């Protein structure tokens, strides 16, 4: 489109500097309906933990609010600590860290996971 | 149009120059559609008769490699620049059904009496020759006749003017160009 590749042009700076430092990356992906979150291992091609909204215990028609995204980042630290993962980075993927992005990344710090 | 060959199981630079002075031979290859490329020796005398012929370039020639026979069309002539004589030949097998581009001479058959010549200032300048072809080998265009007996002064001739008879296309019309062919202009 036009919007899609411009935020890909914004994302490749911090995503490429987290590659050189070899840090366990926490990615994110916002849509106009609902919000994803993944933890990708230190090779760019291996996913360890991944919590979403489209799972079969959370879809309720209310995804797309800031209150919906608080539970997404809440239920992802419980799968990374079950995978034994700390010392992570936070690629915001070209999204301005203000709204539903920032509220998800505060639920990660509460749930025992630390940056 | 017939020529007979041999096998040439000796490659390189040193073995390929001793052919030309000791035995008077010329190297060649035969590469085609469904088989492997096969190198070949020919004589400088026997290619000299074919290269002296007029329409031998746009024509099928049979080849006797050993007792092996093959209908062969020629598309290359590497040639010695300084003295002027033939170097290796690089011709082609002919499949009974394949598209087969090649090159065809022209003639400009009727230009003794032209409108631009007898009435106005008489000059006819042939720009192009050796116009290509793209045709099945069942019908060989040996040549194409172009007539400039009626074209007046100040007019030029494109590729769309002359025609390609009986299932012959032109690659230059398959691109977005139409090259000029012949002019009629005034002498100085």
């Amino acid at each position: 489109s036009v919007k899609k590749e411009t935020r890909l042009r914004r994302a490749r700076k911090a995503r490429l500097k987290m590659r050189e430092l070899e840090t366990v990356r926490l990615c994110v992906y916002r849509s106009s309906q609902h919000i994803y979150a993944q933890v990708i291992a230190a090779d760019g091609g291996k996913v360890l933990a991944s919590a979403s909204t489209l799972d079969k215990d959370l879809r309720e028609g209310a995804t797309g609010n800031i209150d919906a995204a608080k539970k997404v980042g809440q239920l992802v630290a419980e799968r990374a600590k079950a995978a034994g993962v700390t010392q992570v980075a936070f690629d915001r993927s070209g999204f301005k860290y203000h709204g539903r992005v920032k509220a998800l990344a505060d639920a990660a710090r509460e749930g025992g996971l630390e940056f | 149009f017939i020529v007979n060959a041999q096998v040439r199981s000796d490659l390189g630079k040193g073995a390929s120059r001793r052919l030309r002075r000791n035995a008077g031979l010329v190297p060649a290859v035969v590469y085609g559609g469904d088989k492997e490329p096969q190198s070949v020796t020919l004589e400088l005398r026997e290619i000299a008769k074919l290269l002296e012929n007029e329409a031998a370039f746009s024509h099928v020639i049979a080849l006797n490699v050993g007792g092996v026979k093959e209908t062969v069309l020629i598309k290359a002539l590497q040639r010695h620049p300084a003295k002027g004589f033939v170097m290796h030949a690089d011709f082609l097998r002919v499949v009974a059904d394949h598209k087969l581009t090649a090159h065809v001479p022209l003639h400009f058959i009727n230009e003794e009496v032209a409108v631009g010549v007898k009435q106005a200032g008489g000059e006819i300048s042939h720009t192009i020759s050796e116009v290509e072809v793209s045709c099945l080998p069942k019908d060989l265009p040996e040549f194409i006749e172009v007539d400039m007996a009626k074209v007046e002064l100040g007019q030029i001739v494109h590729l769309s003017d002359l025609k390609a008879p009986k299932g012959v296309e032109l690659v230059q019309l398959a691109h977005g160009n139409d090259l000029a062919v012949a002019n009629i202009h005034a002498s100085r």
């Binding site: - | 000059e123 300048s125 020759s129 002498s187 100085r188």
Partner: protein
């Protein structure tokens, strides 16, 4: 005479004159040509002595092409001058010929009017030039 309009530099090395001529040895425009069989270099006044010889043995028509163009400037020091005070000035211009290169082309004439016309232009050039036909 024939020389560039403007040049990115002013003076040039000497170099060498090696090899044969693989591109330049094929007749393209005319149907008769005078190709050169010995290496040398032509000094851009010989070209006008050879052009004005072909363009008066015809006098009727035809068309002339000049395939070669001098672009290499050469120097010459003045007299009673010792060596080593810089580099001399450009006096003339030179094209470099190597065996096989086609010099002149003609078309629209007879096969033997032209043959005795390149005899006039060959007696002004310092090279051994032959006669060739279009194939």
């Amino acid at each position: 005479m024939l020389q560039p309009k403007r040049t990115k530099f002013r003076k040039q090395m000497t170099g060498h004159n090696r090899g044969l001529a693989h591109r330049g040895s094929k007749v393209s425009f005319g149907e008769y040509a005078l190709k050169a069989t010995s290496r040398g270099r032509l000094t851009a006044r010989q070209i006008e002595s050879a052009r004005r010889a072909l363009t008066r043995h015809v006098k009727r028509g035809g068309k002339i092409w000049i395939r070669v163009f001098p672009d290499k400037p050469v120097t010459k020091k003045p007299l009673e001058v010792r060596m080593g005070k810089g580099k001399g000035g450009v006096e003339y211009w030179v094209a470099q010929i190597q065996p096989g290169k086609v010099l002149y082309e003609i078309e629209g004439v007879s096969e033997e009017l032209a043959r005795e016309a390149f005899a006039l232009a060959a007696a002004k050039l310092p090279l051994a030039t032959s006669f060739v036909k279009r194939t």
